[PDB]
Design a protein around this ligand. Structure first.
Ligand SMILES: [Zn+2]
Lengths: 317, 76
């Protein structure tokens, strides 16, 4: 349509940029877009079916921008009040959870009905990873492991790290469980000092990173946005279990623009998210323009109120 | 049972809870330790955001399960 980029914008329906920026980031995550667009006509995935309809318009509309109203309503986060500004990572997590559960439930019912008469979802394939936590009791040396799935890594800022790799290393750093946080060891049947180790047992196809850009101010008893610039690499080496590493290519960056955590606006930078097409674009509701990784890198330096919040990376084949 | 909570600064804190504790009860226990009011809190377990009204048992949360504490950046 009207943007010479060949891309279609999304109309803001009243404080809905938190939905638009996420939909564009998911649309640009090539392998996920393909999962969605190829969904067979006979399926038991009602929400993914609505997403396929929307992705069809983003692919073929002759209009400059379209309304995602039908999908926005079908995927509406039930604890959100329409017209109120919201967290885009909270919406993304809800959306991925809904798309995962409807497919998982459908597969399970189908299999159970066949077994009574006598696998992984698209979300798991595209965004699912696994993390293992190991706690070593320093008294008896027993190590208790626990593996859990994730669709994103919630990257905390260290107490009062300049790069994404610094934040990733901090997320995976070993920790001493001591004093008020001593570990209850059932082998020792007592509270004991322990060492906590965290490793990524399975790297996801698309790695979603949420930068935890908020602190809680104990003087005012209010949360505050963290505006600290964090450098974003085009190529990230994700540390994996056993000292291994996996290369990841930056796909998209969702930016929150605003001095505070109570209000603001979201926009997205993205290039094609297929396995490594190199063109960057800037998606800001109805307006899509050509952009660059230089602009992704310049964000917080040029506009101190604008900060990357959600990042998408794709595993290098 | 002893669970772990990853705080906003990435520190792991321990929490003593019961399988029957509601997500609201866990948010109150986090407020007691961190000072963060429950209406600010979002709790993530194995990628899922925990819903108010549900219990830890509904999510198969047990000893050594890790909950991740996150707040909100609102935008429109
Ligand atoms: Zn022990």
């Amino acid at each position: 349509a009207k943007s010479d980029t060949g891309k279609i914008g999304l109309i803001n329906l009243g404080n809905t940029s938190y939905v638009n920026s996420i939909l564009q980031a998911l649309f640009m995550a090539s392998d996920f877009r393909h999962c969605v667009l190829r969904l067979t006509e006979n399926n038991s995935q009602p929400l993914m079916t609505k997403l396929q309809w929307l992705f069809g318009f983003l692919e073929h509309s002759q209009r400059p921008a379209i309304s995602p109203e039908n999908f926005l309503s079908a995927s509406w986060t039930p604890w959100f009040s329409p017209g109120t500004q919201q967290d885009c990572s909270e919406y993304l997590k809800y959306l991925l959870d809904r798309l995962h559960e409807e497919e998982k439930t459908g597969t399970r019912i189908c299999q159970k009905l066949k077994q009574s008469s006598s696998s992984s979802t698209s979300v798991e394939k595209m965004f699912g990873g696994k993390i293992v936590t190991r706690i070593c009791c320093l008294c008896c040396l027993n190590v208790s492991s626990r593996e859990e799935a994730f669709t994103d890594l919630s990257l905390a800022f260290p107490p009062p790290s300049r790069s994404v790799l610094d934040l990733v290393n901090y997320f995976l750093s070993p920790e001493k469980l001591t004093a008020e946080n001593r570990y209850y060891c059932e082998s020792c049947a007592s509270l004991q000092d322990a060492e906590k180790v965290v490793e990524l047992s399975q790297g996801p196809c698309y790695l979603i990173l949420t930068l935890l850009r908020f602190s809680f101010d104990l003087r005012t008893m209010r949360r505050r946005k963290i505006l600290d610039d964090v450098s974003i690499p085009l190529l990230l080496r994700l540390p994996l279990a056993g000292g291994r590493g996996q290369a990841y290519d930056l796909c998209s960056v969702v930016v929150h623009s605003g001095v505070s955590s109570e209000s603001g606006h979201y926009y997205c930078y993205a290039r094609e998210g297929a396995a490594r097409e190199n063109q960057w674009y800037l998606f800001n509701d109805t307006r899509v323009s050509f952009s660059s990784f230089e602009s992704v890198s310049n964000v917080t330096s040029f506009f101190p109120k604008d900060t990357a919040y959600v990042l998408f990376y794709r595993q290098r084949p | 049972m002893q669970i772990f909570v990853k705080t906003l600064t990435g520190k792991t804190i321990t929490l003593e809870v019961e399988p029957s504790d509601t997500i609201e009860n866990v948010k109150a226990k986090i407020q007691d330790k961190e000072g963060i009011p429950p209406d600010q809190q979002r709790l993530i377990f194995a990628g899922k955001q925990l819903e108010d009204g549900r219990t830890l048992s509904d999510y198969n949360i047990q000893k050594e399960s890790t909950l991740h504490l996150v707040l909100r950046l609102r935008g429109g």
